[PDB]
């Protein structure tokens, strides 16, 4: 088999877990495991051991209190711009789990409120410490998150990234999420080595207090502000999932329609870092403004390589994404069991449609469009590949070789099966690959090409 | 189970075939078993044994001939009638195959003609035969095929639905086609009882000699005029498939958009008998006009019982159709792994979109809408029910219990999993049923209802 073809098996396969794994010598969990984990406090707005029910929330920005639960002193109330981005990460946890947020000021109580503070209970100045929260419950103080002034990443969460973060991360104890392991702040030294199962890093939870890289994931020093995949299942599983989130046609990354900064690049600095989740309609990854070389899957659960990060974006769980658009660089894009749509851009791209009746492009430059297998095309439901490039691109059908390899021939089929046949429909000027596999009784196999293709261009 | 999902699975092993199964005490031959021995006189105006290859034909209406190569004689032209016909005919075989036909004139030779005889050699008047027809080949008469003035329904083909039929039949055999058995008009007295396999019938080739009942179809004392499943294969076999026919969204039926005579009922007294081939775009069986209880299946390969006839309507191997519209009876409709829109129409219907995100409309009366498993409805391609009535329609889900009778649960899961909630949302008015599965660790199915549902509309 080609590289093309391995390169695209490979990519399928990247970040693999769960089922019995080992992964840097720790055991392997799956989105479910992961999200069972984060929540075995078992503990929700709606009480304790109860899944799968939604609630209504009130939130409150405390401008004064009579003390702070912890024993932390020195309050100081939230300024403008924190005010924005804890709404924010409001807005993030309640558009994948079914949760409504609702303001309330003045006496009225709260089940999340948000207040800084900047000395210990000693009443000493403290520049070290960065957040804590309290999990849901009846008691007091339960809900409330504190967020130390002193750090200017908390006094400027808009311009600091690890600001942002902080705010989704302590709003999601006050949901009743847990780190995904037994360790916190000031509880000695804990390090990623103490860390339950592999996939206990930012790259999956923003609940973890460990980097990306600790996965093989690199965000280049930046912080993913919104819930990744695991806190995305694990969420939902208290909750329950929101189905009315971004049901229309949605593009995320450059020309974004989501109004969300996480899910939205403007220009080419822009990174991005984002586990999507979208409740329905036709949907586009659109990477096109990077010149980096980029990995981009579609499959539910899997992760891309994005913008010149690893890892940096997934798709949770329950979703379906439809098409995607790479950038200048040299690309592999990996469609889903759906209808997929992908577009290589510039630069020598390798597209794999999958299952479904998928239309390429391969876009300026020397691409190749692979098929794994005979699924990948059938009549009933065959590709397009729209802008071929005779003498230029290549289709590559080597994985069949597996089978016996694949011979041509020039206009008629010998039934010994295992032979590749391109017709040229002049009127339409269409060329019809079809392949008749081993095993078939019949011509099972097609794609459909707009424009002229050589054998030559046909790897087998 | 309920009866409701016990018709579903009944209609969808209707004429199951192949697979080592034997039939009316014969073995049961697969498409492609079938179509093989439709061809296996391995010839095609490509020469013999040349398989999965196109071809340019031309046809022409004899004025005059030296003689008839079966020795009858009293040659009498096509009158324009026939030409009509015979024109409709040759473009149902181009439909589905890739053939041009193109007609010539004066002295040109052709690889199909057509012409009447109205004697035997002796000179004496011939009322009985029918019609026949000669093989491809390089021999004096190849290709040339021959019908019996004398007889009504050669002299009026267009309204005697036998003259159309036998068209297509002899046009068949110009073209390479054998009937599927080893038997002919003249040796002896043949019957059904000498078929080689089950399927030998004019519900699945029109080459057959043997009525539709022969296989528990029933036309009513119609007859196809056009190419059947079988037919299909196999003449495919031969000249290759035609990708170009009905690309765009074709409609089969009612309101039908295709021009062709054999797809389409203008009012409720008009039969459907045919196969579809369709190449291309989102489309419909539109059966809305019938008052008959009809049951309708969208599988590849599948037959229906259409307006009030039996095995009438089938789809070709290697077709995706999308969509169905019932009639005012009741009526059952299957989907197949696309995404379908089910539309029952008055009358008590049973829908069953099967795999992928269908969208159903019961329609007037007592419907039932159908999941036979948990793959139906999954939330990454959930079904919409768009016009659910509360209290008059039913949800089915007894299926689930061959793994543990489903239970109801009012807002939350209590993770033993097999049971089933009903969510309303008030903002959009819209009722999601969740269904957490036994050995799903998160909540995996969902159907979206537009309207309310009560726990008593749900089948478990
Ligand atoms: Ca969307
Ligand atoms: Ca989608
Ligand atoms: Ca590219
Ligand atoms: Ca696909
Ligand atoms: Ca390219
Ligand atoms: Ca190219
Ligand atoms: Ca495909
Ligand atoms: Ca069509
Ligand atoms: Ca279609
Ligand atoms: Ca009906
Ligand atoms: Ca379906
Ligand atoms: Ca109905
Ligand atoms: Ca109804
Ligand atoms: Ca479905
Ligand atoms: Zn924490
Ligand atoms: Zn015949």
Same mark, same amino acid.
């Given at each position: 088999?080609?590289?093309?073809?391995?390169?695209?098996?490979?990519?399928?396969?990247?970040?693999?877990?769960?089922?019995?794994?080992?992964?840097?010598?720790?055991?392997?969990?799956?989105?479910?495991?992961?999200?069972?984990?984060?929540?075995?406090?078992?503990?929700?707005?709606?009480?304790?051991?109860?899944?799968?029910?939604?609630?209504?929330?009130?939130?409150?920005?405390?401008?004064?209190?009579?003390?702070?639960?912890?024993?932390?002193?020195?309050?100081?109330?939230?300024?403008?711009?924190?005010?924005?981005?804890?709404?924010?990460?409001?807005?993030?946890?309640?558009?994948?789990?079914?949760?409504?947020?609702?303001?309330?000021?003045?006496?009225?109580?709260?089940?999340?409120?948000?207040?800084?503070?900047?000395?210990?209970?000693?009443?000493?100045?403290?520049?070290?410490?960065?957040?804590?929260?309290?999990?849901?419950?009846?008691?007091?103080?339960?809900?409330?998150?504190?967020?130390?002034?002193?750090?200017?990443?908390?006094?400027?969460?808009?311009?600091?990234?690890?600001?942002?973060?902080?705010?989704?991360?302590?709003?999601?104890?006050?949901?009743?999420?847990?780190?995904?392991?037994?360790?916190?702040?000031?509880?000695?030294?804990?390090?990623?080595?103490?860390?339950?199962?592999?996939?206990?890093?930012?790259?999956?939870?923003?609940?973890?207090?460990?980097?990306?890289?600790?996965?093989?994931?690199?965000?280049?020093?930046?912080?993913?502000?919104?819930?990744?995949?695991?806190?995305?299942?694990?969420?939902?599983?208290?909750?329950?999932?929101?189905?009315?989130?971004?049901?229309?046609?949605?593009?995320?990354?450059?020309?974004?329609?989501?109004?969300?900064?996480?899910?939205?690049?403007?220009?080419?600095?822009?990174?991005?870092?984002?586990?999507?989740?979208?409740?329905?309609?036709?949907?586009?990854?659109?990477?096109?403004?990077?010149?980096?070389?980029?990995?981009?899957?579609?499959?539910?659960?899997?992760?891309?390589?994005?913008?010149?990060?690893?890892?940096?974006?997934?798709?949770?769980?329950?979703?379906?994404?439809?098409?995607?658009?790479?950038?200048? *660089? %040299? =690309?592999? &894009?990996? +469609?889903?069991?759906?209808?997929?749509? !992908?577009? $290589? /851009? @510039? *630069? %020598? =791209?390798? &597209?794999? +449609?999958?299952?479904?009746?998928?239309? !390429?492009? $391969? /876009? @300026? *430059?020397? =691409?190749?469009?692979?098929?794994?297998?005979?699924?990948?095309?059938?009549?009933?439901?065959?590709?397009?590949?729209?802008?071929?490039?005779?003498?230029?691109?290549?289709?590559?059908?080597?994985?069949?070789?597996?089978?016996?390899?694949?011979?041509?021939?020039?206009?008629?089929?010998?039934?010994?099966?295992?032979?590749?046949?391109?017709?040229?429909?002049?009127?339409?000027?269409?060329?019809?690959?079809?392949?008749?596999?081993?095993?078939?009784?019949?011509?099972?196999?097609?794609?459909?090409?707009?424009?002229?293709?050589?054998?030559?261009?046909?790897?087998?």
């Amino acid at each position: 088999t080609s590289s093309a073809y391995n390169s695209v098996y490979d990519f399928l396969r990247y970040h693999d877990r769960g089922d019995g794994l080992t992964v840097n010598g720790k055991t392997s969990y799956s989105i479910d495991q992961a999200a069972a984990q984060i929540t075995r406090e078992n503990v929700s707005w709606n009480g304790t051991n109860v899944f799968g029910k939604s609630a209504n929330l009130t939130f409150k920005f405390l401008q004064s209190v009579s003390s702070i639960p912890s024993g932390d002193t020195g309050f100081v109330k939230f300024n403008a711009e924190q005010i924005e981005q804890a709404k924010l990460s409001l807005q993030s946890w309640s558009d994948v789990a079914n949760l409504t947020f609702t303001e309330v000021t003045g006496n009225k109580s709260a089940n999340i409120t948000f207040g800084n503070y900047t000395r210990d209970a000693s009443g000493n100045l403290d520049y070290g410490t960065q957040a804590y929260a309290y999990y849901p419950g009846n008691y007091q103080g339960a809900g409330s998150s504190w967020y130390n002034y002193n750090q200017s990443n908390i006094r400027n969460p808009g311009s600091e990234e690890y600001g942002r973060q902080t705010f989704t991360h302590e709003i999601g104890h006050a949901l009743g999420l847990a780190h995904p392991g037994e360790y916190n702040a000031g509880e000695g030294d804990p390090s990623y080595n103490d860390a339950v199962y592999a996939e206990d890093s930012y790259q999956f939870s923003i609940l973890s207090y460990w980097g990306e890289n600790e996965t093989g994931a690199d965000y280049n020093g930046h912080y993913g502000g919104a819930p990744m995949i695991d806190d995305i299942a694990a969420i939902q599983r208290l909750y329950g999932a929101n189905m009315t989130t971004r049901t229309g046609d949605s593009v995320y990354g450059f020309n974004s329609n989501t109004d969300r900064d996480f899910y939205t690049a403007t220009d080419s600095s822009k990174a991005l870092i984002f586990s999507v989740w979208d409740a329905g309609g036709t949907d586009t990854f659109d990477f096109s403004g990077y010149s980096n070389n980029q990995r981009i899957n579609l499959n539910e659960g899997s992760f891309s390589d994005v913008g010149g990060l690893k890892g940096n974006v997934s798709i949770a769980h329950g979703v379906t994404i439809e098409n995607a658009i790479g950038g200048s *660089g %040299n =690309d592999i &894009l990996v +469609g889903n069991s759906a209808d997929n749509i !992908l577009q $290589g /851009g @510039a *630069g %020598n =791209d390798v &597209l794999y +449609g999958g299952a479904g009746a998928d239309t !390429l492009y $391969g /876009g @300026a *430059g020397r =691409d190749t469009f692979v098929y794994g297998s005979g699924q990948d095309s059938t009549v009933a439901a065959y590709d397009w590949i729209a802008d071929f490039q005779k003498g230029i691109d290549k289709i590559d059908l080597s994985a069949f070789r597996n089978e016996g390899q694949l011979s041509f021939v020039q206009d008629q089929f010998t039934g010994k099966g295992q032979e590749v046949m391109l017709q040229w429909d002049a009127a339409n000027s269409i060329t019809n690959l079809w392949l008749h596999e081993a095993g078939h009784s019949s011509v099972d196999f097609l794609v459909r090409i707009v424009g002229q293709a050589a054998q030559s261009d046909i790897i087998v």
